[PDB]
Amino acid sequence: YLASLIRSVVALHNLINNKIANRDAEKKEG
Amino acid sequence: GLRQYYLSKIEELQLIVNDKSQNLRRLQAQRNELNAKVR
Amino acid sequence: PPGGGEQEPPPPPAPQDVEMKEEAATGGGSTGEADGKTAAAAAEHSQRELDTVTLEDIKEHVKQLEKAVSGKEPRFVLRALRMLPSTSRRLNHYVLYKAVQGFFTSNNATRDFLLPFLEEPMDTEADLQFRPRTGKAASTPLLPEVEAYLQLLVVIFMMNSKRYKEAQKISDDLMQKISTQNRRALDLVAAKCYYYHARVYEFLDKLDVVRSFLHARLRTATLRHDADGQATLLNLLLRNYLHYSLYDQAEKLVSKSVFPEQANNNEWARYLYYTGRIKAIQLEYSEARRTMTNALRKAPQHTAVGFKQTVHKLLIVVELLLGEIPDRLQFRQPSLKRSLMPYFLLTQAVRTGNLAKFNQVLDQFGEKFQADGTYTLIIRLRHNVIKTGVRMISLSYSRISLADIAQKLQLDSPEDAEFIVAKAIRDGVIEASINHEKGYVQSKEMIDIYSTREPQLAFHQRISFCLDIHNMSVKAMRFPPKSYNKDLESAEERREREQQDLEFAKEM
Amino acid sequence: PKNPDLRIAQLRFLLSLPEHRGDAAVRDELMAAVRDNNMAPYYEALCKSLDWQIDVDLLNKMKKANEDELKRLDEELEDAEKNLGESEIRDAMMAKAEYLCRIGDKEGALTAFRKTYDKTVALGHRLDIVFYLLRIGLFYMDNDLITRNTEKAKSLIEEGGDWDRRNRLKVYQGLYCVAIRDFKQAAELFLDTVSTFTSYELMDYKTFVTYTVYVSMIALERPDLREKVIKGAEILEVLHSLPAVRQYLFSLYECRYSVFFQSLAVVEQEMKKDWLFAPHYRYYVREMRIHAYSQLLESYRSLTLGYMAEAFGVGVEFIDQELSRFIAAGRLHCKIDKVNEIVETNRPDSKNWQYQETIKKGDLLLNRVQKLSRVINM
Amino acid sequence: YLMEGSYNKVFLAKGNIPAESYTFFIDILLDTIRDEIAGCIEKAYEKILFTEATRILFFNTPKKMTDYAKKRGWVLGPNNYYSFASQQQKPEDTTIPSTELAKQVIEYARQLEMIV
Amino acid sequence: GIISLLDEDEPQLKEFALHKLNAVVNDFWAEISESVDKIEVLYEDEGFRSRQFAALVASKVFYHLGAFEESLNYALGAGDLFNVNDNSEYVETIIAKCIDHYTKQCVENADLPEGEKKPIDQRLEGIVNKMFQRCLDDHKYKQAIGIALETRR
Amino acid sequence: DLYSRYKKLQQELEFLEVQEEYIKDEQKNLKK
Amino acid sequence: MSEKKQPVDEDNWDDDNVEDDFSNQLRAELEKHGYKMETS
């Protein structure tokens, strides 16, 4: 239950690392 | 009733297009990064 | 006239200055880019329509001297709006009536003059086939009539304007709705006019014809197009059925339209609440506390007093029916000083183990609970107060007489204090024995619930669910993969130069 | 200056919250308020006060005297820059901006303090400025602004030892940890009571002694109590001047159970009247009760219920209703019998109770990450 | 009052009607609580004589206590209701979690490594 | 709310009860939607002069609730009262099940036409070439070249 | 004509179904 | 966005739990014990 609780937070950090690659790229390049 | 028979097929199939094409264009970039890692 | 002649002339041009830039941009964008171009890839005029509702909800208040809105209707109703060579004069006509307001005196629309401001689907080549133009050009005067309401003999003017919008609405229901978002764009305009329709034409007069007409509007849904008609036509169906007592709760159980497939976070979020009160009045068995909770958590950020104070009440009404109660006094922002005191004063009695303290609540605020109408749910809490009691005393004491628990619970009768305990062993709750001959109720010490297979289920409920939110953080994640333009291997010129350098290494 | 500035806010507490007791507090609070140039912080305290109709000239002489100090700064800024020292403009108002901090509000404080923070290249002025921001951060209860300059403060003490800037700082974190209900951290920041000094905010060191004993008696168990607060010569001799607190502490230690409630009503009533303990005087003694109950009750198993009235505290039905809400509250690990008139106990192994907090924290963090996951990506 | 263990007050409402007859409804109301008292005889009670649970319903001494006493247990004896308060058989089950948990472990392993 | 009297055993209140199943089949359409479905009782009963209009309104109410084939078989066995009205939004609802079911069975009948063929209830292929005469007689032949293939005949 | 507007749109469903299976196989084979 | 159609119109939690168990109970114990020294 502990490690299962950690894994989703890890992939959430990986999600924010992708939204930063979305919103600060679409205005720059186009 | 051709407006309510044949044209009623135009409005439906497009909804399947609008998300299965999104599934492909997601999944193929997901392939493409890994293939660049391979080569 | 100086105080009016200096503070009245600036509120005509600056609302004209912003309304030539927001819904004249919707006039140039949703007529020429939804009726003639694809708006599914670019549907920003629906959220811009949300902006041109929420701005005008609090834009107009006054009876409009200086013709600051009263002169807009002789301007904004003379609209052909066919094509750019026909609207190139109309762009001048947004200016030519400013000389009518400023230079001369216009028609002061004060509760009487709405009749010559509505009979223009005919004047100067106006039509109805461009219903992105004629439904938006219906709503753009249909809103500010009814935004302040003006219940003094304006009900028939609003009514006839709703009749012309019903001509646009029957043309929407019958005539050429394929692949234009004619139905889709005017399910939002139809949906928004159902509430001005439903705050003049509902509690004044005769909603039960909007029942049959609304089942016709629901009937024309779900066949031709599968969006925007499945969503609003069910809360707009529900909102007086909850205030009625018809059987339309089990029909909402067996309905196919229960999922309108991502209904825009606003009708969908409240929909789970409206079906939450359904199983409230039909006996919450902890089924809908997650849909009340979900109905709370899918809210935006505006205010709480309209619905959120009532889901903050009714959401734990149904948990007071269970036996669990969180503390309601949380983010004391508007809701937790104004709208709790009878209702938190209710659960203060429930969290105790007193019997007639509940009556000391329910004589003090029986009418406030009938102000909202939760009173028929409040009236059955005595069962859960007394199960709270028997769990409290059966959990606290071990060898306690039946001739003590009735007096501590002020039951005034031991002879059924055998019987409340009896059904407390019948229904589950407390397990152990009663010495009815002696009087004492014995209770065993049940420890090591650890080995007993409950916390593995408390695990297993959340193991798979935390894997589910992991999987959602996987699936809501692979759209920013895009613009991955070129993974060039090395080069062409540097590859030929490396082949030339290796050729020099082979020659050397 | 900010050194007597906590007594001001404590006497604002003394003005506002005791409703009947609001006369001598508005007398001495005015006695300090309409002198020493105070202008801003008492208009709404004047609203909570009476009319005080002619305060106009009283405000005028003091906005005039405030204007004098403002205009001599305005006579200093151009002479300071002509032949410059160490930016003598910000060297004048790096000292008189605390005067502007007391007299003006936090703005003319803050822009001058973050202004002058970049002037001195050593922390010997910077960390005192940050101490001033901490002290006003208590005053406006700036619970978010204290979190910044606590870490920004502590980032400076590592170079050097700076124990008059670390042990003094521990008093600030201790008063924050007892401002919030974090008692085990409050006494742990109050661990030393040796390098702690005859302060400005507790001008009696003995008041600091009372605070650290009132938080320590909850904060630590008997081993820590039978070594730490019972063998300290520095802690014994300062409550040697205390008749009450010495008796209030030792009655629990000497197992003097019935007299413990007597001074418990005294210390709790004083805690009700006290500033900064008024948020939690209701939570304090209900911990003291269940602690004093569990200490005696984990000795015996066959101890009856009509023993505790005459030896522990009178009222058998009071003990009845008081223990019923605690076993029923889910603590005080025992099981009481009634009609054979005996209190039974049990013992839980740390397998269920240690698990209960795990499912609590799991549901809390699951609520957290699920809520954030609904927030981001629409 | 039927929701909680209020029995006696419900049987006081049996006869205290101000409105009309309600006879056919309080006769169903009679049978549906007859099998409910006939249900709550089945606890871990002690010996009850032939007076107490004899008078908990509404009877002095007919053979209706022979109807209930031969219907369920608490057998007709020498002024005795016999307590077969056993509740012994069902615990100590390792095999049922060793089947259900044996499923749920592999179901944990499915959404653990295999891509979905 | 006309629903409770479906056990009269006097067969003209079945008729007078299906008087209100077409005009006011919007408001208490939600009422008689799932609770009472005794259409097949009088439809299989010896009592005639109904079983005709009763299958129409079950073809109304089971359509919108996703029971397309339940509205389709009663759409077959309903009779002359069912296909008499084509001035609504309802013929496109019923031939998109009927002619669709026709061609998706006639692919199997294009596999094996001989033996175990369709028991047509005399309208399932009747409105095929009837609506195909509507296609031949409504001026459009770029599509009437189409239904002649889509019928697999 | 309008009869092509669904047959030519289900032809790309026959062409559209296979692709997620194909990259589904390449999900594991790039690891292998 | 965020229109939300209207149908009708620490420091805080631990002492609120003391308001849960300790709402109208005792409240001012200074004299009940001195009134129980002679009764008990």
Taking phi over 0 as left and psi of -120 to 50 as alpha, with beta for the rest, H8 belongs to alpha
Of D217, D318, D223, the closest CA to residue D263 belongs to: D217
Which residues in E lie closer than 8 A to residue C471 (C-beta atoms)? 111, 116
Residues F55, F43: contact at Cβ < 8 Å?
Answer: yes
Q: Choose from D357, D364, D370, D376 for mutation: most chain A CBs within 10 A.
A: D376
Q: How far is CA D4 from the centre of its chain?
A: 17
d(CA C33, CA C26) in angstroms, rounded, equals 9
Helix, strand or coil, per DSSP, at residue F10 = coil
Chains B and C touch (3+ CB pairs under 8 A): yes
- Bridge-partner residues for G3, per DSSP? none
Chains F and G form CB pairs within 8 A to the count of 6
d(CA F89, CA C223) in angstroms, rounded, equals 10
Q: Would you state the structure tokens that stand for residue D50, as one six-digit string?
A: 């009476």
Resolution in A: 4.3
d(CA C291, CA C297) in angstroms, rounded, equals 10
Does D192 contact chain C (CB < 8 Å)? no
Chain E residues 76-115 with CB within 8 Å of chain G? 115
Amino acid at G19: Q
Amino acid at C322: L
d(CA F90, CA C435) in angstroms, rounded, equals 71
Amino acid at C268: W
- Burial environment of residue C446 by CB neighbours within 10 A (0 to 12, 13 to 18, 19 or more): exposed
Helix, strand or coil, per DSSP, at residue D293 = helix
d(CA D320, CA C407) in angstroms, rounded, equals 14
Helix, strand or coil, per DSSP, at residue G30 = coil
Which residues in G lie closer than 8 A to residue F152 (C-beta atoms)? none
Q: Choose from A18, A19, A23, A28 for mutation: most chain C CBs within 10 A.
A: A18
List, in order, residues 6 or more apart from C298 with CB less than 8 Å away.
C265, C268, C269, C272, D374
Across the interface, whether the CB atoms of B8 and F89 are under 8 A apart is answered no
List, in order, residues 6 or more apart from D332 with CB less than 8 Å away.
D290, D293, D294, D297, D323, D326
Q: Report H helices in D221-352.
A: 222-225, 228-231, 233-236, 243-253, 257-273, 281-297, 308-311, 316-327
Chain C residues 282-311 with CB within 8 Å of chain A? none
Q: Give the chain D residue whose CA is nearest to the CA of A3.
A: D362
Residues D186, D173: contact at Cβ < 8 Å?
Answer: no
Position of tokens 């009733």? Answer: B1
Helix, strand or coil, per DSSP, at residue C108 = coil
d(CA D246, CA D213) in angstroms, rounded, equals 10
Across the interface, whether the CB atoms of C270 and H23 are under 8 A apart is answered no
d(CA C112, CA C153) in angstroms, rounded, equals 8
Of C245, C190, C249, C262, the closest CA to residue C221 belongs to: C190
Position of tokens 């007594």? Answer: D7
d(CA F147, CA F125) in angstroms, rounded, equals 13
- Burial environment of residue D311 by CB neighbours within 10 A (0 to 12, 13 to 18, 19 or more): exposed
Across the interface, whether the CB atoms of B27 and G23 are under 8 A apart is answered yes
Q: Would you state the structure tokens that stand for residue C17, as one six-digit string?
A: 């200055």
Across the interface, whether the CB atoms of D373 and A12 are under 8 A apart is answered yes
Of A11, E114, E109, A9, the closest CA to residue C464 belongs to: E109
Across the interface, whether the CB atoms of D337 and C397 are under 8 A apart is answered yes
- Bridge-partner residues for D344, per DSSP? D335
Of the candidates D365, D369, D377, the beta carbon closest to that of A19 is on D377
Amino acid at C467: L
d(CA E94, CA E88) in angstroms, rounded, equals 16
Residues C396, C357: contact at Cβ < 8 Å?
Answer: no
What is chain E's length? 116
Q: Choose from A4, A13, A28 for mutation: most chain C CBs within 10 A.
A: A4
Question: Distance of CA F147 to CAs A7, F83, F129, G1, Å?
Answer: 57, 20, 9, 13
Position of tokens 């966005």? Answer: H1
Which residues in D lie closer than 8 A to residue H18 (C-beta atoms)? 282-283, 286
Across the interface, whether the CB atoms of B9 and G6 are under 8 A apart is answered yes
d(CA A30, CA C87) in angstroms, rounded, equals 33
List, in order, residues 6 or more apart from C377 with CB less than 8 Å away.
C280, C281, C317, C318, C321
Amino acid at C442: Q
d(CA D368, CA D374) in angstroms, rounded, equals 10
- Bridge-partner residues for C401, per DSSP? C440
Residues D346, C443: contact at Cβ < 8 Å?
Answer: no
DSSP C258-316: T--SS-TTTHHHHHHHHHHHHHHHT---SSSHHHHHHHHHT--SS-STTTHHHHHHHHH
Chain H residues 1-40 with CB within 8 Å of chain C? 1-9, 12-13, 16-17, 19-20, 23
Of B17, F51, C22, D148, the closest CA to residue G15 belongs to: B17
Q: What are phi and psi of C332, to 5 degrees?
A: -45, 50
Residues C258, C249: contact at Cβ < 8 Å?
Answer: no
Helix, strand or coil, per DSSP, at residue C484 = coil
Chain B residues 4-23 with CB within 8 Å of chain C? 4, 7-8, 10-12, 14-15, 18, 22
Position of tokens 């764009």? Answer: C185
d(CA D341, CA D328) in angstroms, rounded, equals 18
DSSP C341-363: HHHHHHHHHHSS--STHHHHHHT
Which residues in G lie closer than 8 A to residue F143 (C-beta atoms)? 1-3
Q: Would you state the structure tokens that stand for residue D121, as one six-digit string?
A: 């290249």
d(CA C386, CA C69) in angstroms, rounded, equals 62
Amino acid at H24: N
DSSP type of residue C442: E
Torsion of CA E71, E74, E80, E84, to 10 degrees: 160
Name chain H's partners: 3 or more CB pairs within 8 A: C, D
Does B10 contact chain G (CB < 8 Å)? yes
Across the interface, whether the CB atoms of C483 and A8 are under 8 A apart is answered no
Beta strand extents in chain D (DSSP E only):
334-336, 343-345
Residues D250, D242: contact at Cβ < 8 Å?
Answer: no
User: Long-range contacts: D266-275, Cβ < 8 Å, 24+?
Assistant: D267/D214, D269/H30, D271/D214, D273/D18, D275/D9, D275/D10, D275/D13, D275/D14
CA angle in degrees (0–180, nearest 5) for D4-D5-D9: 125
Q: Give the chain D residue whose CA is nearest to the CA of A18.
A: D377
Q: H or E segment at C441? A: strand C440-442
Interface residue ranges in chain D relative to chain H, Cβ cutoff 8 Å: 180-181, 261-262, 265, 269, 279-280, 282-283, 286, 309-310, 313-316, 318, 325, 329
Which residues in F lie closer than 8 A to residue G3 (C-beta atoms)? 142-143, 146
Amino acid at D326: F
Which residues in D lie closer than 8 A to residue H29 (C-beta atoms)? 265
Q: How far F86 CA sits from the closest chain C CA (Å)?
A: 14
Q: How far C332 CA sits from the closest chain H CA (Å)?
A: 9
Q: How far G22 CA sits from the closest chain F CA (Å)?
A: 29
Q: Give the chain F residue whose CA is nearest to the CA of G3.
A: F143
Q: How many CA atoms lie within 13 A of F147 on its CB side?
A: 20
Of C385, H24, H19, C408, the closest CA to residue D320 belongs to: C408
Which residues in E lie closer than 8 A to residue C383 (C-beta atoms)? 3-4
Chains E and G form CB pairs within 8 A to the count of 3
Q: How was this model experimentally determined?
A: cryo-EM
Q: Give the chain E residue whose CA is nearest to the CA of C383.
A: E4
Does H14 contact chain D (CB < 8 Å)? yes
Q: How far E114 CA sits from the closest chain G CA (Å)?
A: 9
DSSP A1-30: -HHHHHHHHHHHHHHHHHHHHHHHHHTTT-
Of D64, D141, D77, D166, the closest CA to residue D115 belongs to: D77
Q: What are phi and psi of D136, to 5 degrees?
A: -75, -30
Q: Would you state the structure tokens that stand for residue D49, as one six-digit string?
A: 């006060």
Please say whether the dihedral angle defined by the alpha carbons of residues D9, D12, D18 and D20, taken in this order, is positive or negative. Answer: positive
List, in order, residues 6 or more apart from D339 with CB less than 8 Å away.
C399, C400, C401, C404, C439, C440
- Burial environment of residue D118 by CB neighbours within 10 A (0 to 12, 13 to 18, 19 or more): exposed
For chain A, the farthest-separated pair of C-alpha atoms sits apart, in whole angstroms, at 43
Helix, strand or coil, per DSSP, at residue D219 = helix
Axis-axis angle for helices D106-116, D123-139 (nearest 10): 160
10 Å Cβ neighbour count for D155?
13
Q: How far G12 CA sits from the closest chain B CA (Å)?
A: 9
Of C156, C140, C110, C132, the closest CA to residue C19 belongs to: C140
Produce one character per residue of F5-24: b if its CB has 16 or more CB atoms within 10 Å, e if not: eeeeeeeeebeebbeebeee
Q: Report H helices in C110-231.
A: 131-134, 136-146, 155-174, 182-200, 208-219
Which residues in D lie closer than 8 A to residue A5 (C-beta atoms)? 362, 365-366
What is chain G's length? 32
Of the candidates D344, D366, D377, the beta carbon closest to that of C398 is on D344
Residues H19, C340: contact at Cβ < 8 Å?
Answer: no
Position of tokens 């509702």? Answer: C53
Q: Would you state the structure tokens that stand for residue C399, as one six-digit string?
A: 């060898």
d(CA C221, CA F63) in angstroms, rounded, equals 12
Q: How many CA atoms lie within 13 A of C432 on its CB side?
A: 17
Across the interface, whether the CB atoms of B8 and C176 are under 8 A apart is answered no
Name chain C's partners: 3 or more CB pairs within 8 A: A, B, D, E, F, H
Which residues in C lie closer than 8 A to residue A15 (C-beta atoms)? 473, 476-477
Of the candidates C269, C310, C329, the beta carbon closest to that of H16 is on C329
